mmCIF file of C-alpha atoms (C1' of nucleotides) in Angstrom:
data_model
loop_
_atom_site.group_PDB
_atom_site.id
_atom_site.type_symbol
_atom_site.label_atom_id
_atom_site.label_comp_id
_atom_site.label_asym_id
_atom_site.label_seq_id
_atom_site.Cartn_x
_atom_site.Cartn_y
_atom_site.Cartn_z
ATOM 1 C CA UNK A 1 -63.132 65.124 23.126
ATOM 2 C CA UNK A 2 -63.331 62.009 20.638
ATOM 3 C CA UNK A 3 -62.148 60.188 23.362
ATOM 4 C CA UNK A 4 -64.376 61.780 25.908
ATOM 5 C CA UNK A 5 -67.148 61.043 23.044
ATOM 6 C CA UNK A 6 -65.460 57.480 22.481
ATOM 7 C CA UNK A 7 -65.622 57.143 26.256
ATOM 8 C CA UNK A 8 -69.068 58.204 26.835
ATOM 9 C CA UNK A 9 -70.298 56.810 23.729
ATOM 10 C CA UNK A 10 -68.898 53.627 24.897
ATOM 11 C CA UNK A 11 -70.911 53.903 28.089
ATOM 12 C CA UNK A 12 -67.937 54.913 30.306
ATOM 13 C CA UNK A 13 -68.067 58.519 31.354
ATOM 14 C CA UNK A 14 -65.187 60.355 32.744
ATOM 15 C CA UNK A 15 -64.662 63.882 34.068
ATOM 16 C CA UNK A 16 -63.403 66.649 32.081
ATOM 17 C CA UNK A 17 -60.494 67.258 34.690
ATOM 18 C CA UNK A 18 -59.721 63.353 34.413
ATOM 19 C CA UNK A 19 -59.156 63.827 30.649
ATOM 20 C CA UNK A 20 -57.611 67.031 31.472
ATOM 21 C CA UNK A 21 -55.022 65.116 33.511
ATOM 22 C CA UNK A 22 -54.258 63.194 30.563
ATOM 23 C CA UNK A 23 -54.074 66.036 28.056
ATOM 24 C CA UNK A 24 -53.779 69.714 29.007
ATOM 25 C CA UNK A 25 -56.492 71.372 26.736
ATOM 26 C CA UNK A 26 -56.644 74.605 28.640
ATOM 27 C CA UNK A 27 -60.086 73.560 29.501
ATOM 28 C CA UNK A 28 -61.811 75.725 27.058
ATOM 29 C CA UNK A 29 -60.575 74.539 23.583
ATOM 30 C CA UNK A 30 -62.159 71.381 24.910
ATOM 31 C CA UNK A 31 -65.381 73.012 25.384
ATOM 32 C CA UNK A 32 -66.028 74.606 22.098
ATOM 33 C CA UNK A 33 -64.631 71.401 20.255
ATOM 34 C CA UNK A 34 -67.134 69.055 22.072
ATOM 35 C CA UNK A 35 -70.264 71.029 21.146
ATOM 36 C CA UNK A 36 -69.399 70.902 17.448
ATOM 37 C CA UNK A 37 -68.345 67.312 17.543
ATOM 38 C CA UNK A 38 -71.492 65.965 19.375
ATOM 39 C CA UNK A 39 -73.448 67.859 16.725
ATOM 40 C CA UNK A 40 -71.205 66.453 13.966
ATOM 41 C CA UNK A 41 -72.619 62.980 14.817
ATOM 42 C CA UNK A 42 -76.226 64.224 15.353
ATOM 43 C CA UNK A 43 -76.195 65.497 11.725
ATOM 44 C CA UNK A 44 -74.472 62.328 10.673
ATOM 45 C CA UNK A 45 -77.544 60.815 12.385
ATOM 46 C CA UNK A 46 -75.031 60.421 32.597
ATOM 47 C CA UNK A 47 -73.233 61.102 35.762
ATOM 48 C CA UNK A 48 -73.965 57.700 37.249
ATOM 49 C CA UNK A 49 -70.665 56.284 35.869
ATOM 50 C CA UNK A 50 -68.881 58.412 38.486
ATOM 51 C CA UNK A 51 -70.475 56.721 41.688
ATOM 52 C CA UNK A 52 -68.264 53.628 41.636
ATOM 53 C CA UNK A 53 -65.072 54.809 40.137
ATOM 54 C CA UNK A 54 -64.786 57.047 42.988
ATOM 55 C CA UNK A 55 -65.494 54.392 45.779
ATOM 56 C CA UNK A 56 -62.643 52.371 44.388
ATOM 57 C CA UNK A 57 -60.556 55.304 44.302
ATOM 58 C CA UNK A 58 -61.072 55.507 48.149
ATOM 59 C CA UNK A 59 -60.885 51.576 48.360
ATOM 60 C CA UNK A 60 -64.313 50.986 49.889
ATOM 61 C CA UNK A 61 -66.299 47.811 50.231
ATOM 62 C CA UNK A 62 -69.371 47.510 47.876
ATOM 63 C CA UNK A 63 -72.296 48.636 50.258
ATOM 64 C CA UNK A 64 -71.077 52.320 50.654
ATOM 65 C CA UNK A 65 -71.115 52.376 46.898
ATOM 66 C CA UNK A 66 -74.001 50.132 46.713
ATOM 67 C CA UNK A 67 -76.108 52.781 48.768
ATOM 68 C CA UNK A 68 -75.026 55.731 46.920
ATOM 69 C CA UNK A 69 -76.648 54.790 43.846
ATOM 70 C CA UNK A 70 -80.070 54.765 45.641
ATOM 71 C CA UNK A 71 -79.109 57.928 47.745
ATOM 72 C CA UNK A 72 -77.839 59.958 44.749
ATOM 73 C CA UNK A 73 -80.724 58.900 42.388
ATOM 74 C CA UNK A 74 -83.176 59.655 45.131
ATOM 75 C CA UNK A 75 -81.437 62.997 45.896
ATOM 76 C CA UNK A 76 -81.638 63.512 41.975
ATOM 77 C CA UNK A 77 -85.130 62.033 41.738
ATOM 78 C CA UNK A 78 -87.235 64.610 43.745
ATOM 79 C CA UNK A 79 -85.519 67.968 43.972
ATOM 80 C CA UNK A 80 -82.106 69.619 44.392
ATOM 81 C CA UNK A 81 -80.739 70.482 40.886
ATOM 82 C CA UNK A 82 -77.750 70.895 43.082
ATOM 83 C CA UNK A 83 -74.568 71.301 41.713
ATOM 84 C CA UNK A 84 -73.217 73.033 38.614
ATOM 85 C CA UNK A 85 -71.564 70.154 36.902
ATOM 86 C CA UNK A 86 -73.039 67.363 39.132
ATOM 87 C CA UNK A 87 -69.618 65.723 39.362
ATOM 88 C CA UNK A 88 -69.607 67.401 42.944
ATOM 89 C CA UNK A 89 -72.940 66.215 44.158
ATOM 90 C CA UNK A 90 -71.989 62.770 43.150
ATOM 91 C CA UNK A 91 -69.133 62.678 45.764
ATOM 92 C CA UNK A 92 -71.462 64.240 48.524
ATOM 93 C CA UNK A 93 -73.522 60.907 48.310
ATOM 94 C CA UNK A 94 -70.369 59.097 49.170
ATOM 95 C CA UNK A 95 -69.771 61.553 51.945
ATOM 96 C CA UNK A 96 -73.355 61.232 52.749
ATOM 97 C CA UNK A 97 -73.017 57.581 52.984
ATOM 98 C CA UNK A 98 -69.558 57.459 54.231
ATOM 99 C CA UNK A 99 -70.929 59.038 57.392
ATOM 100 C CA UNK A 100 -73.785 56.822 57.445
ATOM 101 C CA UNK A 101 -71.123 54.328 57.776
ATOM 102 C CA UNK A 102 -67.857 55.114 60.304
ATOM 103 C CA UNK A 103 -64.993 54.604 58.162
ATOM 104 C CA UNK A 104 -62.228 57.325 58.243
ATOM 105 C CA UNK A 105 -62.218 59.147 54.730
ATOM 106 C CA UNK A 106 -62.143 62.517 56.556
ATOM 107 C CA UNK A 107 -62.924 65.375 54.538
ATOM 108 C CA UNK A 108 -59.410 66.420 53.790
ATOM 109 C CA UNK A 109 -58.416 63.027 52.598
ATOM 110 C CA UNK A 110 -61.524 63.097 50.235
ATOM 111 C CA UNK A 111 -60.613 66.444 48.437
ATOM 112 C CA UNK A 112 -57.146 65.657 46.959
ATOM 113 C CA UNK A 113 -57.959 62.149 46.277
ATOM 114 C CA UNK A 114 -60.893 63.162 44.254
ATOM 115 C CA UNK A 115 -59.411 66.703 43.382
ATOM 116 C CA UNK A 116 -62.731 68.516 44.520
ATOM 117 C CA UNK A 117 -63.466 71.563 46.353
ATOM 118 C CA UNK A 118 -64.129 70.862 50.130
ATOM 119 C CA UNK A 119 -66.677 73.952 50.090
ATOM 120 C CA UNK A 120 -68.808 72.286 47.619
ATOM 121 C CA UNK A 121 -69.135 69.351 50.215
ATOM 122 C CA UNK A 122 -70.105 70.681 53.358
ATOM 123 C CA UNK A 123 -72.641 73.142 51.705
ATOM 124 C CA UNK A 124 -73.669 70.348 49.337
ATOM 125 C CA UNK A 125 -73.936 68.433 52.821
ATOM 126 C CA UNK A 126 -76.116 71.269 54.044
ATOM 127 C CA UNK A 127 -78.764 69.963 51.856
ATOM 128 C CA UNK A 128 -78.077 66.550 53.254
ATOM 129 C CA UNK A 129 -78.022 66.909 57.000
ATOM 130 C CA UNK A 130 -81.330 68.157 56.674
ATOM 131 C CA UNK A 131 -82.613 65.816 53.928
ATOM 132 C CA UNK A 132 -81.528 62.715 56.059
ATOM 133 C CA UNK A 133 -85.048 61.674 55.906
ATOM 134 C CA UNK A 134 -85.954 59.357 53.170
ATOM 135 C CA UNK A 135 -82.637 57.375 52.534
ATOM 136 C CA UNK A 136 -83.691 54.880 55.025
ATOM 137 C CA UNK A 137 -83.483 51.619 53.217
ATOM 138 C CA UNK A 138 -83.123 49.269 56.285
ATOM 139 C "C1'" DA B 1 -44.155 90.918 83.093
ATOM 140 C "C1'" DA B 2 -45.029 94.152 79.059
ATOM 141 C "C1'" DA B 3 -44.479 96.146 74.097
ATOM 142 C "C1'" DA B 4 -44.777 95.367 68.517
ATOM 143 C "C1'" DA B 5 -45.259 92.828 64.105
ATOM 144 C "C1'" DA B 6 -46.798 88.794 61.214
ATOM 145 C "C1'" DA B 7 -49.686 85.146 60.637
ATOM 146 C "C1'" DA B 8 -54.355 82.612 61.077
ATOM 147 C "C1'" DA B 9 -57.893 83.046 58.792
ATOM 148 C "C1'" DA B 10 -62.682 84.583 55.420
ATOM 149 C "C1'" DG B 11 -65.510 86.486 53.083
ATOM 150 C "C1'" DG B 12 -65.667 88.609 49.254
ATOM 151 C "C1'" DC B 13 -63.737 91.229 44.362
ATOM 152 C "C1'" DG B 14 -64.133 90.168 40.398
ATOM 153 C "C1'" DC B 15 -63.640 88.025 36.940
ATOM 154 C "C1'" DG B 16 -61.619 82.485 34.562
ATOM 155 C "C1'" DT B 17 -65.600 78.237 34.242
ATOM 156 C "C1'" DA B 18 -69.416 78.867 29.574
ATOM 157 C "C1'" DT B 19 -71.203 82.574 26.609
ATOM 158 C "C1'" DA B 20 -72.558 84.656 21.464
ATOM 159 C "C1'" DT B 21 -72.851 89.786 19.659
ATOM 160 C "C1'" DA B 22 -70.477 92.633 16.870
ATOM 161 C "C1'" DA B 23 -67.469 95.592 15.160
ATOM 162 C "C1'" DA B 24 -62.591 97.863 16.387
ATOM 163 C "C1'" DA B 25 -56.205 96.141 16.674
ATOM 164 C "C1'" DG B 26 -52.316 92.703 16.820
ATOM 165 C "C1'" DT B 27 -49.898 88.184 17.694
ATOM 166 C "C1'" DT B 28 -48.346 84.094 16.705
ATOM 167 C "C1'" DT B 29 -48.044 80.228 14.086
ATOM 168 C "C1'" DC B 30 -47.307 77.792 9.859
ATOM 169 C "C1'" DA B 31 -45.283 77.176 5.770
ATOM 170 C "C1'" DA B 32 -42.470 78.315 1.419
ATOM 171 C "C1'" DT B 33 -38.001 80.487 0.560
ATOM 172 C "C1'" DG B 34 -33.106 81.128 1.125
ATOM 173 C "C1'" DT B 35 -28.280 79.869 3.084
ATOM 174 C "C1'" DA B 36 -24.049 78.223 5.455
ATOM 175 C "C1'" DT B 37 -23.009 73.482 7.102
ATOM 176 C "C1'" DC B 38 -22.492 68.858 7.936
ATOM 177 C "C1'" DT B 39 -21.630 64.583 5.241
ATOM 178 C "C1'" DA B 40 -20.207 60.703 1.523
ATOM 179 C "C1'" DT B 41 -17.942 59.947 -2.822
ATOM 180 C "C1'" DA B 42 -16.273 59.234 -6.469
ATOM 181 C "C1'" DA B 43 -12.920 61.655 -8.897
ATOM 182 C "C1'" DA B 44 -8.299 64.339 -8.401
ATOM 183 C "C1'" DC B 45 -2.388 62.357 -6.791
ATOM 184 C "C1'" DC B 46 0.830 59.559 -4.968
ATOM 185 C "C1'" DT B 47 2.809 55.640 -4.094
ATOM 186 C "C1'" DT B 48 3.057 50.766 -4.636
ATOM 187 C "C1'" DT B 49 3.803 46.325 -7.104
ATOM 188 C "C1'" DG B 50 3.315 42.697 -10.480
ATOM 189 C "C1'" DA B 51 4.352 42.032 -15.562
ATOM 190 C "C1'" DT B 52 7.631 43.549 -19.325
ATOM 191 C "C1'" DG B 53 10.951 44.726 -23.867
ATOM 192 C "C1'" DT B 54 15.235 44.928 -23.780
ATOM 193 C "C1'" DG B 55 20.736 46.869 -22.997
ATOM 194 C "C1'" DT B 56 23.963 44.208 -22.142
ATOM 195 C "C1'" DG B 57 25.795 40.066 -22.852
ATOM 196 C "C1'" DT B 58 28.269 34.332 -24.280
ATOM 197 C "C1'" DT B 59 29.283 32.153 -29.193
ATOM 198 C "C1'" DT B 60 30.295 32.566 -33.928
ATOM 199 C "C1'" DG B 61 32.955 34.195 -37.423
ATOM 200 C "C1'" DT B 62 36.472 38.296 -38.348
ATOM 201 C "C1'" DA B 63 41.246 41.784 -41.040
ATOM 202 C "C1'" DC B 64 45.422 41.928 -39.171
ATOM 203 C "C1'" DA B 65 49.123 43.306 -37.485
ATOM 204 C "C1'" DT B 66 51.620 40.004 -35.083
#
DNA sequence: AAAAAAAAAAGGCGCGTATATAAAAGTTTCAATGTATCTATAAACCTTTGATGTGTGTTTGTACAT
């Protein structure tokens, strides 16, 4: 966690699974340890980071990533709490925007590359195949 | 061409993700303690090898038949 602290506190945010890949922490000993730790400094006293690191993991040009910052922020800004650990609803912006482009990143390839449920995608994409109205920049 | 068995396939059961509440029982993990088991190691013997007083040995002088 002090890494996840040290990471996020250094303005680089990584998912719990990502560190879990580095160290298997039973995903639970992580959580309780984090809460105290954060409050350790508070007494001693940001999911945006995920959009680009994902695009590169798929090897995409900047525009597809460029757009998602607008889309995810705009999808976040109005409504759609949408997600229970917004890690997922980040990726759907790529999926939203990758389909706005025509580049083969077929859902199955997305999943294992980013180790995400496929179900959260399409249902997450439900709120997108309907919200396709206001993301028109050009 | 027809009969029988397993898979293709999904949605949901039902509690892992938190999650704090508290008691109730028990486990495992950690560390001090105890012990036979490696090892060197210097202190045991045995043998070796260089230095060593000296038993035997070359000159002096001898009672002693010859």
